[PDB]
Amino acid sequence: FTLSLDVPTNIMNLLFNIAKAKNLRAQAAANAHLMAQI
């Protein structure tokens, strides 16, 4: 990334999605250590 100033639409969407899925699974699989078992 250009000195940390590399957040284009092609990246933003990806980053937004990554953070989206990463946080989802983080607060799901890492919050109750059994919320992602079903």
UniProtKB/Swiss-Prot annotation:
Modified residues (Isoleucine amide): I38
Keywords for the protein's UniProt record, in alphabetical order: Amidation, Hormone, Secreted, Signal
Claim: Secreted is one of the keywords in the record: yes
Subcellular location: Secreted
Cellular-component GO terms for this entry: axon terminus; extracellular region; extracellular space; varicosity
Keyword Secreted tagged: yes
GO BP annotations listed: adenylate cyclase-activating G protein-coupled receptor signaling pathway; cellular response to hypoxia; cellular response to nutrient levels; digestion; hormone-mediated signaling pathway; positive regulation of insulin secretion; positive regulation of membrane potential; response to corticosterone
Disulfide bonds: none
Chief location category: secreted
GO molecular function terms listed in the Swiss-Prot or TrEMBL record: corticotropin-releasing hormone receptor 2 binding; corticotropin-releasing hormone receptor binding; hormone activity
Top-level taxon: Eukaryota
Subunit structure, interactors included: Binds with high affinity to CRF receptors 2-alpha and 2-beta.
Family in the record: Belongs to the sauvagine/corticotropin-releasing factor/urotensin I family.
Annotated function: Suppresses food intake, delays gastric emptying and decreases heat-induced edema. Might represent an endogenous ligand for maintaining homeostasis after stress.
Protein name stated in the entry: Urocortin-3
Species of origin: Homo sapiens
UniProt lineage: Eukaryota, Metazoa, Chordata, Craniata, Vertebrata
Gene that encodes the chain: UCN3
Covered residues, full protein: 120 to 157 of 161
